[PDB]
Amino acid sequence: LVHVASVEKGRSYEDFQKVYNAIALKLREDDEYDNYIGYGPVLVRLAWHISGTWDKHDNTGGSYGGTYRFKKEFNDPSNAGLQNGFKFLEPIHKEFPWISSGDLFSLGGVTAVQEMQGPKIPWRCGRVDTPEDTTPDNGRLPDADKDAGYVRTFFQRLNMNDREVVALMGAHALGKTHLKNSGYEGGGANNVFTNEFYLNLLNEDWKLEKNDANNEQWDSKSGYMMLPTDYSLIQDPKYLSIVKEYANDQDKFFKDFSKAFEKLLENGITFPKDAPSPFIFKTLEEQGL
């Protein structure tokens, strides 16, 4: 099963920077969402959930097809809450109807990371919408109530190794859990991309508690929380080494996250030899906008 990237006809860097800018300007404008977190974190989770359906074994799922737009995937219980991200992106898609769905969902995640002061994430165009029957079934995204061994095995399906997994999980610096969405009770409200996930894991006094949905999570006196799968990164000795590394080197985390996130967003896509190079978009700040 081969998905060849096909550049939206006649489009170039400038076209995609315009889309980036529209996203980034709306992110700035819609500042009240989710107790003033804004839409940055949900857009990052959207880009992850549309990519994280991928199966390396048969190349089903993945970001290429834009299949989140179809009800089976839209309605996946694992995707509860992401409708907010999709709604945010709808007027962008109306303004730029030439962009493919996969390109828009993935670019929304790139834009959010960068606008939240995260690393530059190189991004390639050419995802092509595929039909409804290519929508992967529900149940390919990960459970949160599980241990390090589960996390490790789960991520092998996405061709991610220990360092990639640990780096990617640093996105959990962003946003919060919502009991109605996932059965986890959120802590904090952060919308600035940092290595704080690792620092929190290592430095907080964690207590294993039950939340109002009767699920276990790790909570600290300072009001932070971790999923069991988050906390598993300091229970497993191989993950722990990497957590300590990112807790002590913001730049290394940024670089590794950028690589792993691009890879996640590109899994399943064959880029022709004469495809454009990855684009690195300027932030609104860098443009003086």
Ligand code: HEM
């Ligand atoms: C074992 C892997 C993972 C599990 C079990 C997991 C689980 C969760 C759960 C349960 C929530 C809360 C959803 C809600 O209640 O709204 C959450 C939020 C989030 N996740 Fe993950 N996640 C995982 C990996 C990742 C990865 C790899 C990324 C991105 C690189 C990511 C980015 C986020 C973001 C940005 C939010 C916040 C969204 C918001 O605030 O609206 N997650 N995730």
Ligand SMILES: Nc1ccc2nccn2c1
């Ligand atoms: N959105 C999320 C999801 C998990 C998490 N653990 C600590 C902070 N976190 C934020």
